[PDB]
Amino acid sequence: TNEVAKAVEECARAAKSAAPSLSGAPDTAIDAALESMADRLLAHRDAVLAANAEDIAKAEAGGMSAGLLDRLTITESRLTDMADQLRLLAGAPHPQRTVELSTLDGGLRLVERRRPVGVIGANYEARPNVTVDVASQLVKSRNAGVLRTGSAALKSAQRLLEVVIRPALTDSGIDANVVQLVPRPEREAAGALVRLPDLVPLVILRGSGESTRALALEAAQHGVRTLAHADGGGVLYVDEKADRDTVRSLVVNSLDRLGVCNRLNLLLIHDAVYEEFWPVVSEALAERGVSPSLPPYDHPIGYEWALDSEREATVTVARVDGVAEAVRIANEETSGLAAGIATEDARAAEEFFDGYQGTGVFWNAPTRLLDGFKLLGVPETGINLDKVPGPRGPVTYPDLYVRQYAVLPVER
Amino acid sequence: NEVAKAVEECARAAKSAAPSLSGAPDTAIDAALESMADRLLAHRDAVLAANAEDIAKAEAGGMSAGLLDRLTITESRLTDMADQLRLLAGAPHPQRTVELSTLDGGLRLVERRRPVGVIGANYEARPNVTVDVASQLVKSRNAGVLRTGSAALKSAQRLLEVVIRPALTDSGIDANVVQLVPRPEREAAGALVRLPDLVPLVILRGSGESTRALALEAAQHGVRTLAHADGGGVLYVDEKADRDTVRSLVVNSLDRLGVCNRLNLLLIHDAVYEEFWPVVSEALAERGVSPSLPPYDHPIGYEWALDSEREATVTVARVDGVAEAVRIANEETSGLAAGIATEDARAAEEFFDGYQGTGVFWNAPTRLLDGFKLLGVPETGINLDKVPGPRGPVTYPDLYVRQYAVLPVER
Numbered sequence: 001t002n003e004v005a006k007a008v009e010e011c012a013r014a015a016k017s018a019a020p021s022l023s024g025a026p027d028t029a030i031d032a033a034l035e036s037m038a039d040r041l042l043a044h045r046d047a048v049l050a051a052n053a054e055d056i057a058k059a060e061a062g063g064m065s066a067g068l069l070d071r072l073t074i075t076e077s078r079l080t081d082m083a084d085q086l087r088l089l090a091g092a093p094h095p096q097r098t099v100e101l102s103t104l105d106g107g108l109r110l111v112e113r114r115r116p117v118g119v120i121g122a123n124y125e126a127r128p129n130v131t132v133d134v135a136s137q138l139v140k141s142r143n144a145g146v147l148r149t150g151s152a153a154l155k156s157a158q159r160l161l162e163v164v165i166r167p168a169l170t171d172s173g174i175d176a177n178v179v180q181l182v183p184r185p186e187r188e189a190a191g192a193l194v195r196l197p198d199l200v201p202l203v204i205l206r207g208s209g210e211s212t213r214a215l216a217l218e219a220a221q222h223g224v225r226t227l228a229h230a231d232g233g234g235v236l237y238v239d240e241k242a243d244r245d246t247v248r249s250l251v252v253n254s255l256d257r258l259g260v261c262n263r264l265n266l267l268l269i270h271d272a273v274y275e276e277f278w279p280v281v282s283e284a285l286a287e288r289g290v291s292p293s294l295p296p297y298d299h300p301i302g303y304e305w306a307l308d309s310e311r312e313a314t315v316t317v318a319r320v321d322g323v324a325e326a327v328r329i330a331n332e333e334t335s336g337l338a339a340g341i342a343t344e345d346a347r348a349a350e351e352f353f354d355g356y357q358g359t360g361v362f363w364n365a366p367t368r369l370l371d372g373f374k375l376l377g378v379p380e381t382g383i384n385l386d387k388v389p390g391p392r393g394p395v396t397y398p399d400l401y402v403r404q405y406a407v408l409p410v411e412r
Numbered sequence: 413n414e415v416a417k418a419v420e421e422c423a424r425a426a427k428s429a430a431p432s433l434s435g436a437p438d439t440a441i442d443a444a445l446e447s448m449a450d451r452l453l454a455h456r457d458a459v460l461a462a463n464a465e466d467i468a469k470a471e472a473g474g475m476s477a478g479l480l481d482r483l484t485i486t487e488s489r490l491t492d493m494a495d496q497l498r499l500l501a502g503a504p505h506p507q508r509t510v511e512l513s514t515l516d517g518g519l520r521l522v523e524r525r526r527p528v529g530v531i532g533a534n535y536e537a538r539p540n541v542t543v544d545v546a547s548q549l550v551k552s553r554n555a556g557v558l559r560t561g562s563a564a565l566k567s568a569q570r571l572l573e574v575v576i577r578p579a580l581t582d583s584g585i586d587a588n589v590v591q592l593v594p595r596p597e598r599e600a601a602g603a604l605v606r607l608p609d610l611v612p613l614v615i616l617r618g619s620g621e622s623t624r625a626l627a628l629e630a631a632q633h634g635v636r637t638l639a640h641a642d643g644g645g646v647l648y649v650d651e652k653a654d655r656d657t658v659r660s661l662v663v664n665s666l667d668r669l670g671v672c673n674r675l676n677l678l679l680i681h682d683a684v685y686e687e688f689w690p691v692v693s694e695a696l697a698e699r700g701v702s703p704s705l706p707p708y709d710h711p712i713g714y715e716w717a718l719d720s721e722r723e724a725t726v727t728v729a730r731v732d733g734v735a736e737a738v739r740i741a742n743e744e745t746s747g748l749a750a751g752i753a754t755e756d757a758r759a760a761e762e763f764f765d766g767y768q769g770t771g772v773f774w775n776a777p778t779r780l781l782d783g784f785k786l787l788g789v790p791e792t793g794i795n796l797d798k799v800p801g802p803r804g805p806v807t808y809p810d811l812y813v814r815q816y817a818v819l820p821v822e823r
């Protein structure tokens with residue numbers, strides 16, 4: 001039997017049928033539902049944490065790693081973080097859904113409308129808080145959702161859906177079926193979620209590496225769009241006119257977390273200052289317990305260390321001829337997520353900005369800042385690396401809409 | 413080998429020249445467009461001479477009257493092309509760098525608009541489309557790889573050599589930013605949607621199965637498209653519809669029978685079906701169009717514009733109400749455009765809330781779904797899709813990708 005594929009389709013049809021309820025909800029109701037989720041999460045701590053305790057106990061009996069148990073575990077900090085983010089999202093602005101453009105010939109007028117996508121899918125790790133984060137962002141943007149979480153977090157996610165997410169929607173006058181959670185432990189569910197172009201045309205993929213890379217390819221092959229950043233890794237180019245203090249700071253502050261997509265991965269150093277800056281670069285790398293990878297390399301120049309658990313505390317270093325070579329390497333050998341330049345020469349920075357084609361470009365600023373919250377003050381839906389018009393780089397809730405034109409009588 | 417090699421060569425030449433266009437100021441772009449208008453008129457003789465040779469070859473080869481018409485550049489078409497170029501030259505340039513805010517650590521954030529890079533375009537053997545597409549790509553600072561139907565290749569090459577490229581060179585832009593595949597082979601179209609790292613987006617101007625095939629091939633190769641393979645407007649006549657309004661809508665949505673946004677499927681509320689039948693019949697007959705009534709020998713959403721022999725037809729169906737009309741429109745038609753005829757604002761609101769297509773209309777013909785008719789700027793090509801990004805009519809300000817930049821606050 002096709003039980004896994006069947007459960008995903010069922011969730012999608014249920015989300016689609018309920019979606020009009022969310023589409024027609026006024027701003028006050030959407031915001032009240034988000035505020036209420038925050039209140040319920042804190043009011044029902046005992047129930048939520050109890051569900052989580054069972055997942056944690058179950059994961060330990062299966063021999064889960066201490067790092068993945070950390071991600072599964074809901075602490076007080078993460079509980080209060082969840083609620084604070086829900087309230088921030090509730091207070092965030094709603095763009096105007098109908099803008100009058102002009103009158104047209106024949107006693108008519110034109111309006112540009114923002115409509116929801118409909119049903120958006122999401123695949124992510126066994127981290128309970130992600131269920132609330134994703135659910136809340138789709139609700140804010142009037143999109144129903146089909147969520148797929150790592151199986152180790154199912155009970156936690158289901159309790160959050162039951163006690164936090166749904167009652168809040170219902171009290172605000174929204175059909176609670178607009179948020180669906182795939183009830184299957186099977187990892188195959190993720191694949192089934194990117195194969196329903198008629199029901200779930202867009203899927204948010206939160207993962208990193210080979211698994212996300214495969215899901216993103218499978219989706220594209222089935223006509224399903226994604227918001228994904230399978231391959232990351234920031235580039236930093238140290239120019240001839242760089243400042244020692246700034247470089248030291250950039251290196252240290254781009255390596256605070258070694259498993260993320262927007263950390264420093266490839267360090268390019270202008271040949272003319274290599275010898276002078278290496279002592280500063282070495283001091284900075286040592287500060288973070290990171291070792292340089294020098295030629296001859298054992299992997300491609302753009303190899304992303306964050307995806308190699310065993311060797312994550314590593315950074316690839318290359319000496320380059322100038323800005324033009326730095327740009328070419330950045331564009332041709334990396335995924336085009338983020339790249340920065342360290343320099344005090346405005347002309348060198350301008351050339352780097354004009355040449356680099358990635359989603360975020362930086363001048364004397366760490367690539368670790370490429371994040372929706374850090375840049376825009378609103379939660380990040382998930383970075384997208386497409387090379388075409390539409391959402392790109394950090395994605396936030398106002399990106400999750402489709403355009404529609406409406407024409408009607410001028411006096412109506 | 414040779415066809416795919418020529419297409420790849422064109423893409424690489426376009427990509428290599430792109431920075432010159434990307435870095436050109438607004439004045440240079442607009443001057444280039446103005447110059448194209450001037451050159452089209454000034455070099456009328458050479459442009460028309462090349463077209464006359466394409467016509468002779470087409471006639472000798474036995475091409476149909478309709479296709480010869482599309483291939484023929486008339487005096488009027490030439491002046492229309494020049495007029496459109498001047499309109500586009502005067503159209504505004506959106507701010508490519510927007511200061512968003514300051515950030516911690518003495519930094520500031522900018523949202524930048526960058527060109528897509530190289531955009532492909534596949535279209536029929538219509539000479540003016542080469543100028544239409546090339547000009548809109550130039551306006552949006554995108555380089556282009558264009559592929560036209562082989563019957564117009566000569567005519568298109570002459571426009572590229574005499575009108576497009578000298579105008580670019582004259583404004584300080586590398587003329588190689590506009591490429592025209594020099595192959596007669598139809599296979600070049602398929603080759604054009606198989607280069608994701610060079611030409612990530614391709615504009616498909618056709619209709620029907622050929623465009624549907626190219627859009628699927630693009631998807632299987634990781635290439636994105638702006639396409640509207642399927643069209644056909646819907647019109648729902650509500651119980652509270654006005655008689656003269658309905659008549660006007662039917663007549664004015666059937667001025668052209670081969671377009672994607674004409675009336676195709678007419679849904680009439682059950683309670684007024686008998687009363688409106690004489691109004692609808694007379695309005696269809698006035699346009700030489702026959703109704704297709706049940707039992708049908710085709711799907712309710714079958715698009716007459718794609719059936720040359722039966723183009724002069726409109727499907728008529730009786731519906732129970734607004735909810736049924738919305739379901740049929742959403743589930744059984746292309747999602748391009750639907751209208752409602754009614755004097756009841758509550759029925760209109762319900763239709764507007766429920767219908768999911770790219771354009772929705774209240775007492776207004778679906779023929780208005782066009783970039784020029786709505787926005788007063790040329791149409792790049794409608795994109796019929798339902799995900800974030802360009803949708804409905806597409807115009808030059810849609811052809812960009814987002815980039816964030818962070819730099820020191822005082823720089």
Ligand SMILES: [Ca+2]
Nearest residue numbers: 106107108409
């Ligand atoms: Ca009127």
Ligand SMILES: [Ca+2]
Nearest residue numbers: 243244245246
């Ligand atoms: Ca200093």
Ligand SMILES: [Ca+2]
Nearest residue numbers: 272273275276
């Ligand atoms: Ca030196």
Ligand SMILES: [Ca+2]
Nearest residue numbers: 283284286287
């Ligand atoms: Ca130290």
Ligand SMILES: [Ca+2]
Nearest residue numbers: 434435436437
């Ligand atoms: Ca410039």
Ligand SMILES: [Ca+2]
Nearest residue numbers: 387608609634
């Ligand atoms: Ca790609």
Ligand SMILES: [Ca+2]
Nearest residue numbers: 618619620622
């Ligand atoms: Ca066709």
Ligand SMILES: [Ca+2]
Nearest residue numbers: 602628629632
């Ligand atoms: Ca194929």
Ligand SMILES: [Ca+2]
Nearest residue numbers: 683684685686
């Ligand atoms: Ca009646």
Ligand SMILES: [Ca+2]
Nearest residue numbers: 730731732736
């Ligand atoms: Ca019936």
Ligand SMILES: [Cl-]
Nearest residue numbers: 025026027028
């Ligand atoms: Cl509202």
Ligand SMILES: [Cl-]
Nearest residue numbers: 098111406764
């Ligand atoms: Cl409206």
Ligand SMILES: [Cl-]
Nearest residue numbers: 205206207212
């Ligand atoms: Cl994923």
Ligand SMILES: [Cl-]
Nearest residue numbers: 262368370371
């Ligand atoms: Cl981050």
Ligand SMILES: [Cl-]
Nearest residue numbers: 436437438439
């Ligand atoms: Cl400018």
Ligand SMILES: [Cl-]
Nearest residue numbers: 509522524817
């Ligand atoms: Cl800037």
